[PDB]
Structure 1
Amino acid sequence: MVILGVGYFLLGLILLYYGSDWFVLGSERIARHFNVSNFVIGATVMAIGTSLPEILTSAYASYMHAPGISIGNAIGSCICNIGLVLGLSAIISPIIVDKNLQKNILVYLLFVIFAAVIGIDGFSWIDGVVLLILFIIYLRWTVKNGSAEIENPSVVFSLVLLIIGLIGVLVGAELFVDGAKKIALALDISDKVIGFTLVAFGTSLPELMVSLAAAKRNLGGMVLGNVIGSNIADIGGALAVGSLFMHLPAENVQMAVLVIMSLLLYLFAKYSKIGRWQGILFLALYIIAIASLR
């Protein structure tokens, strides 16, 4: 069963590789079709699509009476797309944030702080409803300020490329995790806090691969949109749905970390830029986090 495990592992890795580029290319074409910025298509379509694992993981975990995992992989994903994902992408393709995007990032920061504040006691179902509504408003507000649309061929291929791309990365992530679980099982290596905090990683591979793909094609806005949007999607969506099934226990330490990194993200976007040395810091902080957090 290790033989299939190896097979699933790199094939999914191959799907993650090409599927992310196709998802990026498809989204970029769709953005130009509906006359919206790359940030917009990244913060909505791409963000939500890549956050489907978190949502279904949080929903499932909390439903199976494991709310700590539910909040733990919602919030863990946040720290991860700012620290690891954005960190790598910033180095690859430095971003100077325009003022229209700085405002969106400022709203993000307020959202995170607010979630952190009402989250001190934990996360009730009402807490979840609130976050989900703000999530909806954000998506609406982001689209309106990012769209300038005035206006069956060139769209169809664009849409197909986006859909196949998303299926590629979602399935690719599945096979990566599955293929990994099989090798660990067949080699009797299977721990399951490893087994968790790696499915708590495979949850975040779609965001990682997709952002790296956009970074290589110098689509900084799409990257930034993907990171910001995925965090609101995991908090206002994944975390939210989790609280609907069960009260999520407080994660003040990780929330404090998330707020700080979110704060740093805004400041860099407002007065400096998101380039190499800012990317350096994010990676550093992520290293310290995965070395000090549990």
Structure 2
Amino acid sequence: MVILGVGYFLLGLILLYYGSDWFVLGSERIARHFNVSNFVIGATVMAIGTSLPEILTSAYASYMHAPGISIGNAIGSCICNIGLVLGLSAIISPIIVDKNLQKNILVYLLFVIFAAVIGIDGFSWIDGVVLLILFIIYLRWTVKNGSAKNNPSVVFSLVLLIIGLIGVLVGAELFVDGAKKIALALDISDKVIGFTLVAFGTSLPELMVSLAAAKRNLGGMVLGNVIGSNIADIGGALAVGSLFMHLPAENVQMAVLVIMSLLLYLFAKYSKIGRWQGILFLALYIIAIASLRM
């Protein structure tokens, strides 16, 4: 069952490549239809849609008595979204953040700090409930501040979005599924092959989507996708995971995330998110994946 593993692998890449573009284009059209900014549509629809793997992963893992994976996958994705995903995107298409999206990012920072503080002694199911409620509040707050027949322009837009989303979710799965089949067929299969492959596999939707939007100079959409995903990973994935079982404290990873989130805000507020800010993000992500524990 090799080659068919290469089959799922390459095909998943193709579905990720074109699927992300369709998702970006469809989301961009939807945003203009509902008269909202690209940030808003990225922080809500796109973010939640791409964070669906994390939510299902964290829920399933915690239910299977593996709470370490649940919180590990959740936080690792957050670090990945700022370090790798935003890092690459910022370099491709530098972002100048308007004074109104700066407020949203500051709110994001507060949310992260709050999660880190209450997570010091781990995350209880009550911690999850609270985070999930704030998650819900953030969404409505974001949409309001960015708001205000079978129309063929609207239908085609929704088809682009949905099919594109299916493309990146199925594609990301085929990528991981093809990679597990190859490693097994080549007898090079550990168990953090493995945990590394799936945790990064859940981040593949955000990566390809944000890179697609970055290529089209949609920096607001990219920034929304990153900020929204992180909140969806904490208020959604991590929260749901804590409902099934107490999640052990990841104080080091949370600290890294808080620092990265702090850096993201300061750059957006007093400077820009461009090449050298993107380079710094990639540097920290590389240092993170080099010295953080598996």
Displacement, 1:120? 0.2
Give the Cα–Cα distance (whole angstroms) in 2 for the partners of residues 193 and 69 of structure 1. Answer: 11
Displacement, 1:107? 0.0
Displacement, 1:153? 1.7
- List per-residue Cα deviations over 1:47-82 (Å, max 9, x = no partner): 000000000000000000000000000000000000
Displacement, 1:152? 2.5
Matched with 2:99 is: 99
Give the Cα–Cα distance (whole angstroms) in 2 for the partners of residues 153 and 195 of structure 1. Answer: 44
2:194 partner SS: helix
- Unaligned 5+ segments in structure 1 are none
Give the Cα–Cα distance (whole angstroms) in 2 for the partners of residues 175 and 257 of structure 1. Answer: 30
TM-score by length of 1: 0.99
- Unaligned 5+ segments in structure 2 are none
Give the Cα–Cα distance (whole angstroms) in 2 for the partners of residues 162 and 192 of structure 1. Answer: 35
Give the Cα–Cα distance (whole angstroms) in 2 for the partners of residues 106 and 125 of structure 1. Answer: 26
1:2 partner SS: coil
Matched, 1:207 2:206: yes
- List per-residue Cα deviations over 1:65-122 (Å, max 9, x = no partner): 0000000000000000000000000000000000110000000000000000000000
1:194 partner SS: coil
Cα RMSD (Å): 1.3
Displacement, 1:197? 1.1
- List per-residue Cα deviations over 1:180-213 (Å, max 9, x = no partner): 0000000001111121111010010000000000
Displacement, 1:32? 0.1
Give the Cα–Cα distance (whole angstroms) in 2 for the partners of residues 292 and 108 of structure 1. Answer: 26
Identity percentage over the alignment?
Answer: 99
Displacement, 1:269? 0.3
Matched, 1:24 2:33: no
- List per-residue Cα deviations over 1:221-275 (Å, max 9, x = no partner): 0000000000000000000000000000000000000000000000000000000
Give the Cα–Cα distance (whole angstroms) in 1 for the partners of residues 34 and 190 of structure 2. Answer: 47
Give the Cα–Cα distance (whole angstroms) in 1 for the partners of residues 165 and 142 of structure 2. Answer: 22
Give the Cα–Cα distance (whole angstroms) in 2 for the partners of residues 142 and 100 of structure 1. Answer: 11
For these two proteins, the number of residue pairs brought into alignment is 293
Give the Cα–Cα distance (whole angstroms) in 1 for the partners of residues 193 and 260 of structure 2. Answer: 25
Give the Cα–Cα distance (whole angstroms) in 1 for the partners of residues 254 and 285 of structure 2. Answer: 14
Matched, 1:68 2:68: yes
Matched with 1:282 is: 281
Displacement, 1:282? 0.2
Deviating 4+ runs (over 6 angstroms): none
Matches within 5 A, 1:31-70: 31-70=31-70
- List per-residue Cα deviations over 1:142-164 (Å, max 9, x = no partner): 00001119x92210000000000
Give the Cα–Cα distance (whole angstroms) in 2 for the partners of residues 190 and 200 of structure 1. Answer: 16
Give the Cα–Cα distance (whole angstroms) in 2 for the partners of residues 23 and 227 of structure 1. Answer: 15
Give the Cα–Cα distance (whole angstroms) in 2 for the partners of residues 4 and 101 of structure 1. Answer: 45
Give the Cα–Cα distance (whole angstroms) in 2 for the partners of residues 31 and 152 of structure 1. Answer: 15
